[PDB]
Ligand binder design. Structure first.
Ligand SMILES: *[C]/[C]=[C]/N1=C2[C]=C([C])C([C])=[C]C2=N([C][C]([O])[C]([O])[C]([O])[C]OP([O])(=O)OP([O])(=O)O[C][C]2O[C](N3[C]=NC4=C3N=[C]N=C4[N])[C]([O])[C]2[O])C2=C1C(=O)[N]C(=O)[N]2
Ligand SMILES: *[C]/[C]=[C]/N1=C2[C]=C([C])C([C])=[C]C2=N([C][C]([O])[C]([O])[C]([O])[C]OP([O])(=O)OP([O])(=O)O[C][C]2O[C](N3[C]=NC4=C3N=[C]N=C4[N])[C]([O])[C]2[O])C2=C1C(=O)[N]C(=O)[N]2
Lengths: 956, 959
């Protein structure tokens, strides 16, 4: 019934399109030929779109020719003119001045506009303020010129009266650089505060203001910002505010119903610009990387059908809320028309929107049919304009593109116009897990209000339990020494979090004896049962997630999301090493000769001493302990005195999991006392130590000593830190580079063996990158870790505080200071600090600081950048931001690090994804979360059996 | 009829034979109305039962208590009952335990128109005492049986052929039972000794009118047996006697050529002799042995090939019956019927033929052949329960075989047409070459010194090596030869007044030049693609293969390695080359990890830097080559410091490395003193990795030095260390003593015990102590000690005068504390330390704890497996260990409780091969060294991860 009428209207529209005078897919222009070649070859598509992406960042003809050769001086004029020429198809002007006559020419053709100022990512508060100022000026200046405009009723009036002649679209995240979902209300208040002057200026000038919709991670926040703002009294009576809804989202119809109910309660209409959505590939990739549900439909017919249903619902409620239909899809457009006519809605009530330069024959047909047509009108600089051009290239060459089906794939009219609900196969947001494959634990989404509330509840309960009395635990019995160490809250140093019983060397001897006794039977516990215990530990960690986070927040100063990642990593180690042991338990047939069975197997070693750091207080400790234990060894663990409350929780979970007495023993105390004792003991077969270089070198000297009565060779598994650099190539995407460097350098206040402490920046890009880096570093917030708004918290203790401040003062005598942030008092808050033009051989660029202190180093070219990057004692992490295939390959082959990253930050290594560890003085034998690690806790062995007796051997 | 319808006439004869068989009242071995037949039915239906039942039968006569029989029964799946039942099956196939017991059986067979050939069953001849006893048994048998046969009446069907009278007494002799030290490399000496031991038996038989038949054993002695036999019976005193016989096995690929060759010889001899034509008894053994050795398979592997070759051989011998006399040994009615017809087409009278079958086998067929008027001779085994239960196992194996003709007839109910068809019809040949599975690693085959051409090349290579002495060895840095002026003279350890090498011993300044050359070279070598580095290592292996004999000779003369030990050394060196090259070709491939969209992540390996290689002398090419090629193929450069005792060997390695084409500085050759330049490269700031194999004392020192971070050192040193063992073999009460003694002798005295894997402790349970130790001592008395150049050497000298004096001092101290069971005699002129065995050594005694690295064994008593394991586990070391046992539960306990890195069950504990037995251990035996296995190459590398964000402008490429 109504479905047959929609098809009929689509047929009328396509017939009219046949009468128009060409299509963007035309292969007689550069844009069409680019697309055809891209659609024919997936490697060409990737290389072509990446080349276009980097092109406006290249500032010499030789460098354009070099990038051209790698991806596939007067070739720069030629190629760049053609490619920048394609951008002019989709960008109305480089500035409001250039765009104005284009906007007026469209008005003469019965099309209006909505202006959007293109920009790079807002990473700093300076950039946010500049974007806000651009919008204030645009609204004032365009409203002023429009005072002289004659009225064009098809575009300037609807069925109710006059419409604003000027319409601007605003990108919410461009207005504030420090959105933080864990600090939901504070972030929400700030966004409203930044949006309010723009909406107010627009209202005062009679301008339409549309708030765009960005990626899913800010979708819920944008809707709360928008509705709360336009419900304020000064705005409550203005109809000409709008919000975007993306029909490709699974929750979008629910938002449409919610916005409709809100419009009724508001008592004044506002507008919904209904789109399908711009971030589809991005959303599927992000959700899979995070192990989160996929927020978009993944069958395109679902998106089309939900768009049409959303359109129908809004039209049904047009008295309260006003839809505008943004789509180039003739099926979609025809469906909207019929749903409107079924309701006797007049043509002048509707509004259609299309991108400038897109779907010209369809655009003209809609106008000829009497409908109001509004063009999305981008304005901006060459660099964001080329990003925009790439998105057009990506959409138009998509396999699901309706326009591609019409103008390139020669699809039938029936296929183009069919009901998306027909033959509809639904998709699920849950990505199926491949059986046998390892998956990382998903991290918390603090945009979920229930998770913020559980976090605040877990923090309150932790605070009420202070101080935590921690006992020594040997053979599952709690012991005391009488020597108590007070561990204060590093964010508030007058509060005691833990009172730690510090063991004597006699108790360390008892721990050694208990582990050696237990090893006699634990080494014969079957692998599956050892693995099952490790699995139960991971389940307990999963159950107690919020309590575990709260302990790390308070005792170690780890910010909420850092603490959560620690718990996920701890769970990951458990599951990964349990999975690995289940594989390695199987004897490996070797040789394969008849008459002789020979198998390669692994054996446990004995008592393992575990000496763990504080900076990943649950994850690293748990990885060492579970790997050693699941391999059939027993464990004496000596946790860091700064994080012994965290380790105490681990011991309690180990006891609850059911590890037999003595298999794992909990030996808190001083490293120079009981740590030294278990390193030196004759029963210790394996030492796992992650910490400073000085202690590691000392441990390795001690472990080489064969103690009286020791009948084995000790093995050291050692990680000792880094002096890690990120290289910034001249053609780097500075949005990605600045964001990655900031988080790599200042995440957990730089207290990571993987932290970026060196940024090696090539000379041509130095000023632009360093200015954005400094302005972004000025914008990050430093708070007690308990405060969800903290980007950085404190460093671990007073000793580190004093040492770091000492390093900063020393460097100020030697190097140009670019930035030093302000920090709160009351705890060990070291300030984020950046020095510039630091020599590559300077002490600041050589010695590990483990604090929020960055050395920016200049390089003439990639040759010098690599030499500088390789010139330290360390070889742990390193990275490059580059859009040159040959430079990326040079970095891959020549940068001497154990974990190399291209075009992302250099921290956050995850189990299985990024096995972690390096060489030089960064360690030996420690590649955690990878397929070699567990074997370090074992001995290989070979069992060879002659099966031939009396001239006969059984077959295998 | 038709022209060339012989196959139809053979089928007809077979149909007559089977028809007559239906009229007999004789039992089949396959009848499930006996215990034997029911065992077989269950065995043919279930392979796990077949294995367990045959192994149980094997071990039963070695068990000496009722409780232990019940224990073995429970473990494999009533001692009087089971042993009585199993011994009953043995008496079906063994005429008697002694000649006296067998005599009435032989005479009863005669009354039923069948004659016999007597064979004395025995265990392996491992010692000269056992060889002498075997000889005496035959001399007594021949005299006594001939004497009793003087009173026998004549039975013409069996006592006459077509020419005249035949011997009434016929004995069969197993050649290797007469001598315990056959050594193919000393071919002529072994052949003379075998002939000397056979000669009195052949002579006594001839004097008594007795037929003497020489059996044919496994392929490794087939050619030797034929030379022994033909030369013996062509000697003046024997060349006129007709009643000697030799066995030919038609399942051998070369048997038709041997048949033709024996016929020519019979003509030249001028007096006939006999060929007993069989198919062959060692089929499974030969295919297993040849595959394990990488040698061509000497048997056909299609059973119809054996049948067809049998008939071809039979026709040829019949065609030449004037010169040589065939006897047809087979239970197969097709085979028998073909022989009958081939004889009839040649107008040969029936009385000229002779058919032979095993006692107790094929009763219905046997009786039918006799009724048809043919002469039938029964193979008549005589012997004790233990060899008799071995023989019963061979009968069970043959009768349950899928290819057995008797099984096809009496068990598988195959049609008469299938049973009688021409084996040549549609016959597809097999190849002696086993196809290599692609991508799989194979070990290099060792030389077969039974091949005369290979002995000649060995003697040629030794002559050329000796004429080149002394070898002047230079230091080689950056492919340039250097001298120091400090010369170390390395004497021939078999003849200590002869200098083999004059070695330039490097200075520390030259060690610095070696370190600098390696570090400079590392800068470019680390970027040579894996495939090209692996190809250089493959070329090195090819050069080693080409120069095999020259490389053996160097090890024989400089290190005292006996021929076969040195050959095994070259094979292991080639194996290291190919295995590490193969492994690097696998590890070059980046491993995708995580697999998330939008981010490529790969796990890879990197080289480490300059590698110091400090190699021992006891495997002078193999271990050194494995360290060097593993390091280099992984992308590292190398400074190698060879042992002063074996630098001429290592000099040969360096020359091959240069010839293979390794660029200058990638590998540097730094001879000298370990405490001088070895220490220097261990301590140097550029050295990233140290591979050392040697003594515990040096290993601990090196690990101590390597932990120091030197000035300018910006890395942590890795040590790859192997440090020796105090390795034990446990002898369970039920051990197969043939295997146990042989395995322990070679494990203890091979290369005079100078192996880290050598058995220096033998832990023997009390019940079997006296039997095992007596055979061990007697076998140890029989092995020969010679200069290594002599192919008859079982052991040669120890490495140098220091080791000699140290070892003789240990022997002298131990003689004051422990019972001396045996000390061998040794020649002079070199460092010949005697093989020495002490008995009842306490497990905690110094002799049973400190590694000696010499031919010195401590035999230790154990009350039970509990104490045996406790003693075995009580040392500083955990390298190799082994057990001889036929108890499944005891074998499992050793697997789970013996603390060693290389555990062996029912074989020797030395001879670890690349890929087959990855080698290395724990406690004080080493750390990080499991050579020739899938973890080893990674020790020379660093793991790394490369992670690339592929998402740009909201798009990422698919993989
Ligand atoms: C920021 C700015 C913006 N906006 C806008 C505005 C306007 C005026 C317009 C017109 C637009 C826009 N956007 C974009 C949109 O959304 C879209 O993307 C476009 O437009 C295109 O679409 P259409 O045309 O309708 O076409 P079609 O073809 O029909 O479709 C396409 C689509 O679909 C989907 N998909 C794909 N694939 C798939 C899907 N789904 C499911 N599944 C699958 N497989 C997607 O979506 C595509 O696209 C926008 C805006 C805003 O604001 N925001 C957003 O998001 N967007
Ligand atoms: C030392 C002792 C001995 N000898 C003898 C003597 C007599 C009188 C007789 C009768 C025998 C003998 N031996 C054994 C023989 O050789 C045989 O083995 C038996 O006998 C059996 O055969 P006959 O019966 O014919 O059956 P038949 O079934 O038809 O056949 C079987 C056979 O075949 C073969 N195979 C198996 N499988 C196979 C084969 N081939 C190839 N392929 C395959 N797969 C085998 O061979 C069997 O067996 C003897 C003797 C001597 O001296 N030596 C020897 O070696 N043997």
């Amino acid at each position: 019934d109504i479905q047959s009428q929609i098809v009929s209207r689509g047929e009328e529209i396509l017939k009219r399109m046949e009468s128009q005078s060409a299509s963007i897919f035309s292969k007689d222009f550069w844009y069409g030929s680019i697309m055809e070649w891209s659609m024919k070859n997936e490697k060409f598509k990737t290389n072509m779109f990446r080349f276009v992406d980097v092109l406006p960042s290249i500032n010499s003809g030789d460098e354009v020719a070099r990038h051209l050769k790698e991806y596939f001086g007067l070739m720069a004029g030629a190629i760049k003119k053609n490619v920048m020429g394609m951008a002019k198809m989709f960008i109305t002007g480089e500035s409001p001045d250039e765009a104005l006559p284009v906007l007026k020419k469209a008005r003469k053709n019965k099309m209006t506009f909505t202006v959007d100022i293109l920009g790079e990512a807002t990473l700093s508060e300076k950039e946010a303020q500049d974007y806000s100022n651009k919008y204030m000026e645009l609204v004032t200046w365009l409203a002023k010129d429009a005072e002289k405009w004659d009225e064009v009723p098809q575009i300037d009036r609807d069925h109710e009266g006059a419409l604003p002649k000027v319409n601007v679209s605003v990108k919410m995240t461009a207005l504030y650089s420090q959105i933080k979902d864990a600090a939901w209300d504070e972030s929400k208040k700030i966004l409203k505060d930044r949006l309010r002057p723009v909406f107010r200026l627009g209202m005062e000038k009679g301008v339409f203001v549309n708030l765009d919709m960005e990626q899913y991670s800010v979708k819920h926040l944008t809707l709360e910002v928008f509705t709360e703002l336009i419900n304020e009294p000064e705005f409550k009576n203005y109809k000409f505010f709008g919000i975007v809804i993306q029909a490709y989202l699974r929750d979008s119809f629910e938002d449409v119903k919610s916005l409709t109910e809100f419009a009724q309660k508001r008592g004044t209409p506002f507008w919904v610009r209904l789109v399908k959505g711009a971030y589809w590939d991005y959303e599927t990739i992000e959700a899979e990387q995070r192990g989160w549900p996929v927020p978009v439909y993944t069958n395109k017919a679902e998106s089309d059908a939900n768009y049409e249903l959303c359109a129908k619902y809004l039209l049904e409620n047009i008295k309260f809320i006003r839809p505008a239909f943004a789509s180039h899809n003739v099926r979609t457009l025809a469906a909207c028309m019929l749903y409107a006519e079924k309701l006797n809605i007049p043509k002048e009530a509707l509004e259609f929107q299309m991108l400038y330069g897109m779907a010209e024959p369809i655009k003209k047909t809609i106008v000829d049919m009497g409908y109001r047509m509004r063009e999305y009108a981008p304005v901006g600089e060459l660099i964001p304009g080329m990003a925009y051009l790439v998105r057009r290239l990506l959409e138009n060459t998509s396999n699901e593109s309706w326009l591609r089906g019409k103008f390139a794939d020669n699809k039938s009219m029936a296929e183009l116009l069919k009901d998306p609900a027909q033959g509809l196969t639904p998709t699920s947001p849950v990505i199926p897990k491949k059986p046998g494959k390892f998956y990382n634990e998903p991290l918390l989404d603090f945009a979920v209000k229930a998770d913020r509330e559980k976090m605040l509840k877990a923090l309150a309960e932790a605070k009420a339990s202070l101080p935590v009395n921690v006992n020594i635990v040997i053979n599952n019995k709690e012991l005391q020494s009488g020597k108590i160490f007070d561990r204060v809250n590093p964010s508030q140093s007058d509060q005691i979090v833990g009172k730690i019983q510090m063991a004597t060397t006699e108790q360390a001897e008892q721990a050694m004896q208990a582990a050696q006794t237990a090893y006699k039977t634990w080494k014969n516990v079957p692998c599956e049962q050892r693995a099952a215990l490790v699995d139960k530990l991971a389940d307990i960690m999963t159950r107690d997630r919020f309590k575990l986070i709260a302990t790390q927040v308070l005792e170690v100063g780890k910010p909420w999301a850092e603490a959560d990642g620690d718990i996920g990593e701890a769970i990951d180690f458990c599951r990964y090493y349990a999975r690995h042991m289940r594989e390695l338990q199987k004897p490996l047939r070797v040789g394969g000769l008849p008459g002789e069975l020979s198998h390669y197997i692994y054996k446990s070693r004995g008592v393992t001493a575990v000496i763990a750091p504080w900076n990943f207080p649950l994850a690293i400790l748990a990885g060492m302990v579970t790997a050693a234990a699941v391999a059939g060894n027993t464990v004496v663990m000596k946790p860091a005195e700064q994080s012994t409350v965290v380790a105490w929780g681990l011991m309690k979970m180990i006891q609850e999991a059911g590890f037999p007495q003595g298999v794992i023993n909990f030996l808190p105390g001083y490293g120079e006392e009981v740590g030294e004792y278990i390193v030196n003991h004759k029963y210790t077969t394996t030492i796992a130590f992650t910490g400073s270089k000085a202690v590691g070198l000392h441990i390795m000297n001690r472990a080489a000593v064969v103690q009286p009565g020791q009948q084995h060779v000790k093995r050291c598994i050692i990680e000792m830190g880094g002096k890690n650099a990120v290289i910034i190539d001249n053609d780097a995407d500075l949005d990605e580079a600045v964001d990655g460097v900031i988080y790599s350098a200042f995440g957990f206040s730089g207290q990571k063996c993987s932290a970026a402490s060196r940024v090696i920046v090539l000379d041509e890009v130095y000023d632009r990158f360093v200015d954005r880096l400094v302005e972004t570093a000025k914008s990050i917030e430093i708070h007690p870790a308990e405060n969800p708004k903290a980007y950085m918290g404190p460093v671990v203790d007073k000793e580190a505080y004093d040492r770091i401040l000492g390093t900063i003062a020393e460097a100020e005598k030697n190097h140009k200071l670019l930035f030093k942030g302000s920090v709160p008092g009351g705890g060990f808050f070291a300030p984020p600090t950046i020095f510039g033009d630091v020599p590559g051989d300077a002490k600041l660029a050589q010695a590990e600081i483990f604090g929020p202190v960055v050395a920016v180093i200049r390089a003439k070219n990639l040759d010098q950048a690599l030499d500088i990057a390789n010139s330290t004692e360390y070889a742990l992490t390193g990275g490059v931001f580059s859009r040159s295939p040959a430079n990326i390959n040079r970095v891959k082959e020549e940068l001497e690090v154990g974990n190399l990253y291209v075009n992302r930050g250099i921290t956050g290594a995850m189990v299985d994804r990024h096995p972690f560890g390096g060489f030089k003085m960064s360690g030996i034998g420690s590649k955690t979360g990878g397929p070699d690690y567990l074997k370090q806790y074992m001995e290989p062995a070979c069992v060879t059996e002659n099966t031939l007796r009396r001239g006969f051997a059984p077959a295998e």
